[PDB]
């Protein structure tokens, strides 16, 4: 089951403004973005704030720490810059910013690059210099996914942007996947063999359709660290998700559990050891709690 372990809200605040979360390198410490553009570091078990940092002048939508715990990507709503890279080492300082990119991820095998999305366009930046290396967009192959998010594959040699597979080295589109929905652009399976674009599961080798999984419709998807479980929550208030998330066996895409928290979800994340699941849920207008579950 998902046994509730603990709950906490943003300390002191009349209205709790948690918008997103990620587990840090440090065990029992969660990072949370707020609707006022702050990064908070919380003890997940005590529910006590340890540290607060000013990142953006608008709501944090999404964040991602680097595996080495040295770097953090943030994205905001109406700020400029919209996304940024932060040093989490000595002083908490902005390394680089990414202009109009509303979503950013690290590269996967080696975290030496950032991939940002602006609408249908993907930008690849170098972490050290912060120089835009590549702009990926082909007007001939675009799907114009409303909620497009560009992503590297596990080995960083491919990118999926707007349902288009790109060879990173040659910067050539090598395959466009057919469009079946208006919103969701898809992710790589951590096994490196499959891409998941909404309900469709494509083989990377043959580009054949392996499965249809209707339950994934309009879902953002995140895998547990071992790549054994896939979490999905249907997109929709400022609330990006409805009231439920679903788990699937990542090996065979069979359903496991449907969890309905009866409250709108802003975000979820699992820790490095996949013991715990953190969910940001609205109680109400904006009064979010972080709920911690034992997986």
Task: List residues binding ligand N6O (CB under 6 A).
Answer: 20, 61-62, 103, 147, 149, 220-222, 231-233, 240-241, 245, 265-269
Q: Report d(CA 173, CA 258) in Å as an integer.
A: 36
Q: How far is CA 240 from the centre of its chain?
A: 12
Distance in Å, CB of 222 to ligand N6O, minimum: 4
Distance in Å, CB of 108 to ligand N6O, minimum: 13
Distance in Å, CB of 232 to ligand N6O, minimum: 6
Distance in Å, CB of 237 to ligand N6O, minimum: 13
Distance in Å, CB of 270 to ligand N6O, minimum: 9
Distance in Å, CB of 294 to ligand N6O, minimum: 18
Distance in Å, CB of 117 to ligand N6O, minimum: 9
Whichever of 208 and 214 has its CB closer to ligand N6O, that residue is 214
Whichever of 62 and 123 has its CB closer to ligand N6O, that residue is 62
Whichever of 207 and 242 has its CB closer to ligand N6O, that residue is 242
Q: Which residues contact 233 (CB under 8 A, 6 or more apart)?
A: 219, 220, 241, 242, 244, 245, 246, 265, 268
Whichever of 147 and 225 has its CB closer to ligand N6O, that residue is 147
Pairing of strands 187-188, 172-176: unpaired
Whichever of 160 and 268 has its CB closer to ligand N6O, that residue is 268
Supply angle C-alpha 78, 19, 24, rounded to 5.
115
Whichever of 95 and 147 has its CB closer to ligand N6O, that residue is 147
Task: Please count the other Cβ atoms lying within 10 Å of the Cβ belonging to residue 14.
Answer: 7
Q: Which residues contact 41 (CB under 8 A, 6 or more apart)?
A: 24, 29, 30, 31, 49, 50, 51, 52
Closest CA to 120 of 169, 161, 176: 161
Whichever of 99 and 172 has its CB closer to ligand N6O, that residue is 99
Q: Report d(CA 106, CA 88) in Å as an integer.
A: 15
Q: Which residues contact 260 (CB under 8 A, 6 or more apart)?
A: 243, 244
Task: Please count the other Cβ atoms lying within 10 Å of the Cβ belonging to residue 75.
Answer: 26
């Amino acid at each position: 089951a998902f046994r509730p372990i603990s709950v906490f809200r943003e300390a002191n605040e009349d209205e709790s403004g948690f918008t997103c979360c990620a587990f840090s390198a440090r065990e029992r410490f969660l990072m949370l973005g707020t609707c006022t553009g702050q990064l908070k570091l919380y003890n997940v078990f005590s529910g006590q704030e340890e540290a607060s940092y000013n990142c953006h002048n608008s709501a944090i939508t999404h964040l991602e720490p680097s595996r080495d715990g040295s770097l953090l990507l943030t994205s905001a709503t109406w700020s400029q810059p919209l996304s940024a890279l932060w040093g989490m080492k000595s002083v908490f300082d902005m390394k680089h910013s990414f202009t109009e990119d509303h979503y950013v991820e690290f590269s996967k095998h080696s975290q030496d690059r950032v991939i940002g999305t602006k609408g249908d366009i993907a930008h690849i930046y170098d972490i050290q210099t912060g120089n835009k290396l590549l702009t990926l967009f082909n007007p001939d192959l675009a799907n114009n996914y409303k909620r497009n998010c560009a992503t590297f594959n596990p080995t960083d040699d491919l990118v999926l942007n707007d349902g288009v597979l790109w060879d990173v080295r040659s910067a050539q589109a090598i395959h466009k996947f057919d469009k079946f929905n208006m919103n969701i652009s898809g992710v790589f399976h951590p096994n490196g063999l499959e891409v998941i674009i909404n309900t469709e599961i494509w083989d990377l080798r043959t580009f054949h359709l392996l499965h249809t999984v209707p339950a994934l419709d309009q879902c953002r998807v995140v895998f547990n660290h071992t790549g054994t479980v896939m979490y999905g929550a249907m997109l929709q208030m400022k609330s990006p998700f409805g009231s439920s998330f679903r788990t699937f066996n990542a090996t065979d895409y069979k359903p496991i559990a449907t969890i309905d928290v009866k409250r709108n979800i802003f975000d979820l994340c699992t820790d490095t050891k996949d013991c715990y699941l953190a969910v940001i849920e609205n109680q109400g207008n904006m009064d979010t709690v972080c709920r911690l579950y034992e997986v």
